[PDB]
Design a protein around this ligand. Structure first.
Ligand SMILES: Cc1nc(C)c(-c2cc([C@H](C)c3ccccc3)n[nH]2)s1
Ligand SMILES: [K+]
Ligand SMILES: [K+]
Length: 214
């Protein structure tokens, strides 16, 4: 039994099937009242909602599904004929995410790809019939935001207008990625400030006694 399974169980026992809103609220409740977990959450969720509503992307790529929260969040807004592709490195999480989408009734809009971003991204054109992406949501390993962004470019998957939306760029932080897209005149950058809440998690003090110079 894992934390991720417990999240899914809580949803299955408390949310109304076919109701994505209901699913989102159950995950947000669990991860902030019952047991802390990595979770985009409703505050940042509203920023995502506004971005999707503004740009109405049709083909969306998500890096890092975890338990499906972001997938449910985005896919519930996607229009008929839209496709969300989600890459998830961990088979257990990929399975959790599939169940999350089934329960929300959003599974027809999403294709979960199980594997590493740098192995999958070069396959998107040939194997998944992708010309260019409308939107990319980055939420996977923080040190892979910059190299995957460059890999997307090299593969020809970005067009003028493609929206990159990156989470957790402050905490834990992705300073190389932020410096690149802000520095490069090929990206127009807006930063939406929000919060990350921790609750009932393991922390600690370090005691360090100076021994003198050496
Ligand atoms: C090279 C990589 N390709 C993918 C698709 C990765 C990936 C990361 C995650 C989860 C969300 C995560 C996010 C942050 C820290 C730990 C775990 N899922 N999938 S890594
Ligand atoms: K820039
Ligand atoms: K503030």
């Amino acid at each position: 039994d894992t934390k991720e399974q417990r999240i899914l169980r809580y949803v299955q026992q408390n949310a109304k099937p076919g109701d994505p809103q209901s699913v989102l609220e159950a995950i947000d409740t669990y991860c902030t009242q019952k047991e802390w977990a990595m979770n985009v959450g409703d505050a940042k969720g509203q920023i995502m909602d506004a971005v999707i509503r503004e740009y109405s992307p049709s083909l969306v790529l998500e890096l890092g599904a975890y338990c499906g929260y972001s997938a449910v969040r985005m896919a519930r807004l996607l229009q008929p004929g839209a496709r969300l592709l989600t890459m998830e490195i961990n088979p257990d999480c990929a399975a959790i995410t599939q169940q999350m989408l089934n329960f929300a009734g959003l599974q027809d809009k999403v294709t979960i790809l199980n594997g590493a971003s740098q192995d999958l991204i070069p396959q998107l054109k040939k194997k998944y019939d992708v010309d260019t992406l409308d939107m990319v949501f980055l939420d996977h390993w923080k040190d892979r935001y910059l190299p995957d962004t460059l890999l997307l470019e090299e593969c020809g998957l970005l067009r003028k207008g493609t929206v990159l939306l990156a989470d957790n760029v402050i905490v834990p932080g992705t300073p190389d990625f932020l410096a690149y897209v802000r520095g490069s005149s090929s990206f127009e950058c807006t930063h939406y400030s929000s919060y990350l809440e921790y609750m009932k998690v393991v922390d600690g003090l370090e005691k360090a006694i100076y021994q003198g110079p050496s």
